[PDB]
Amino acid sequence: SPLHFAASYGRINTCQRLLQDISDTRLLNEGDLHGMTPLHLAAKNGHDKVVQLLLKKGALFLSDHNGWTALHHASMGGYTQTMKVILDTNLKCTDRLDEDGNTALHFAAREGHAKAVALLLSHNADIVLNKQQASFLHLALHNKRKEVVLTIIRSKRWDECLKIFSHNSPGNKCPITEMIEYLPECMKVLLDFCMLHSTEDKSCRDYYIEYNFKYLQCLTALNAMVQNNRIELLNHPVCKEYLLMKWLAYGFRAHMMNLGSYCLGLIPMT
Amino acid sequence: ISNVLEWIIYTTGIIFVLPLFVEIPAHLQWQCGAIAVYFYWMNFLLY
Amino acid sequence: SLEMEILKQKYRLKDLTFLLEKQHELIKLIIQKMEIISET
Amino acid sequence: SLEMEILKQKYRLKDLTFLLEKQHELIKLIIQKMEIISET
Amino acid sequence: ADVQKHASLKRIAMQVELHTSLEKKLPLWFLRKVDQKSTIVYP
């Protein structure tokens, strides 16, 4: 028991006096009523010196009765300093799964800790489904974690993050149609990347601007914006150019074919 | 009601024009014309 | 008033939750340095 | 009633952030007077 | 005065329901030949 208290509250000078009897690791790797080690308790409370000391003395990446690692507990609190210490010993830790299949990056996202998501996501964290068939991005979105979802969209890995979902789920859809349902100001932040300005001087005859539609195709995104009453995304220049294009492409042709076949009776009768 | 007006137009715009093939009372031709000419324009709003 | 009175309440609440997040890290520091004898 | 309900919510939040700003300055006084020996 | 409360969305909801109804009725090869992933504008 006593080292679990000393480690749980960062009491580094007590850990250096309990562990001074360094002849066996049986305490340093011990169990608990909840099956946590001293290294889990140090991580759980964010103690960046004690989590390092235990790793320096001889700690092991064992797991809770719930299957959680030290890095899961560090992520759950957003304690980037304790994560950075864990990853400096064993970056090979990062992919570990609990009883529900949550990788460490699921917790950093679900709890809304954006700088913790940035640390795991810039390292080689495995983007993977949990065993409720959700990605870390669905766990952010179903909890309205703006700064996590925005950090994922700003990050150099967004184009891997979007591709990873299970089509057969009734609960989890393509993430764009989750952002439109839960966090529309992130969808605004995403569509701002889709506007390119060529010449930085809008008065010039050589000026142009360009729109890219890859997030509005699978009209899945715009149906989701209508069903969620998103008037301020429907009015966004990328959506106006997407509809104007869709109308110029075939919508106008199909309408004028239909109206023309009627007008060809309407006018001759008068 | 769009599906209903299209029957009133096409079943009556034929009668206004049946004299292209079959001679018909002048009164029935224009009584149909007054209905067909009306519903062609009323139903144009639904396009 | 509400369309700025709630916005002022937002600031008053924001620099309350930031003051508590500064204070929670003094209470952790007390347990970290506190002399403990005859309770362990 | 919202054009005074939020004004009451303001008064409640104002005298809460005053109570926390009074409490923060007892926690600083605990660290200032606390006995620390051999667990530094 | 309650239609005008929604009109700025109802315009776009009518357009989205029209264009998706046509995507459900046009054949897929025609949509691939005619639809377009990016567009330029010259203000």
Curated annotation (Swiss-Prot), chains C, D:
Residues bound to a 1,2-diacyl-sn-glycero-3-phospho-(1D-myo-inositol): 8-14
Annotated localization: Cell membrane
PTM comment, free text: TRPA1 activation by electrophiles occurs though covalent modification of specific cysteine residues in the N-terminal cytoplasmic domain.
Coiled-coil portions: 4-33
Superkingdom: Eukaryota
Protein function: Ligand-activated Ca(2+)-permeable, nonselective cation channel involved in pain detection and possibly also in cold perception, oxygen concentration perception, cough, itch, and inner ear function. Has a relatively high Ca(2+) selectivity, with a preference for divalent over monovalent cations (Ca(2+) > Ba(2+) > Mg(2+) > NH4(+) > Li(+) > K(+)), the influx of cation into the cytoplasm leads to membrane depolarization. Has a central role in the pain response to endogenous inflammatory mediators, such as bradykinin and to a diverse array of irritants.
Disease linkage: Episodic pain syndrome, familial, 1: An autosomal dominant neurologic disorder characterized by onset in infancy of episodic debilitating upper body pain triggered by fasting, cold, and physical stress. The period of intense pain is accompanied by breathing difficulties, tachycardia, sweating, generalized pallor, peribuccal cyanosis, and stiffness of the abdominal wall. Affected individuals do not manifest altered pain sensitivity outside the episodes.
Domain remarks: C-terminal helices from the four subunits associate to form atypical coiled coil structure; this region is probably involved in binding the inositol polyphosphates that are required for optimal channel activity (in vitro).
Subunit architecture: Homotetramer. Interacts with TMEM100. Interacts with EGLN1. Interacts with the scorpion wasabi receptor toxin at the same site that electrophiles but in a non-covalent manner.
Entry similarity comment: Belongs to the transient receptor (TC 1.A.4) family.
UniProt protein name: Transient receptor potential cation channel subfamily A member 1
UniProtKB/Swiss-Prot annotation, chain E:
Function recorded in the entry: Ligand-activated Ca(2+)-permeable, nonselective cation channel involved in pain detection and possibly also in cold perception, oxygen concentration perception, cough, itch, and inner ear function. Has a relatively high Ca(2+) selectivity, with a preference for divalent over monovalent cations (Ca(2+) > Ba(2+) > Mg(2+) > NH4(+) > Li(+) > K(+)), the influx of cation into the cytoplasm leads to membrane depolarization. Has a central role in the pain response to endogenous inflammatory mediators, such as bradykinin and to a diverse array of irritants.
Boundaries of the shown chain within the full protein: 965 to 1007 of 1119
Assembly, per entry: Homotetramer. Interacts with TMEM100. Interacts with EGLN1. Interacts with the scorpion wasabi receptor toxin at the same site that electrophiles but in a non-covalent manner.
UniProt-recorded name of the protein: Transient receptor potential cation channel subfamily A member 1
Location of the protein in the cell: Cell membrane
Disease entry from the Swiss-Prot or TrEMBL record: Episodic pain syndrome, familial, 1: An autosomal dominant neurologic disorder characterized by onset in infancy of episodic debilitating upper body pain triggered by fasting, cold, and physical stress. The period of intense pain is accompanied by breathing difficulties, tachycardia, sweating, generalized pallor, peribuccal cyanosis, and stiffness of the abdominal wall. Affected individuals do not manifest altered pain sensitivity outside the episodes.
Taxonomic lineage from the root: Eukaryota, Metazoa, Chordata, Craniata, Vertebrata
Family to which this protein belongs: Belongs to the transient receptor (TC 1.A.4) family.
Domain notes: C-terminal helices from the four subunits associate to form atypical coiled coil structure; this region is probably involved in binding the inositol polyphosphates that are required for optimal channel activity (in vitro). The ANK repeat domain consists of a convex stem structure formed by five ANK repeats and 11 additional ANK repeats that form a crescent-shaped structure that surrounds the protein core.
PTM (free text): TRPA1 activation by electrophiles occurs though covalent modification of specific cysteine residues in the N-terminal cytoplasmic domain.
Organism of this sequence: Homo sapiens
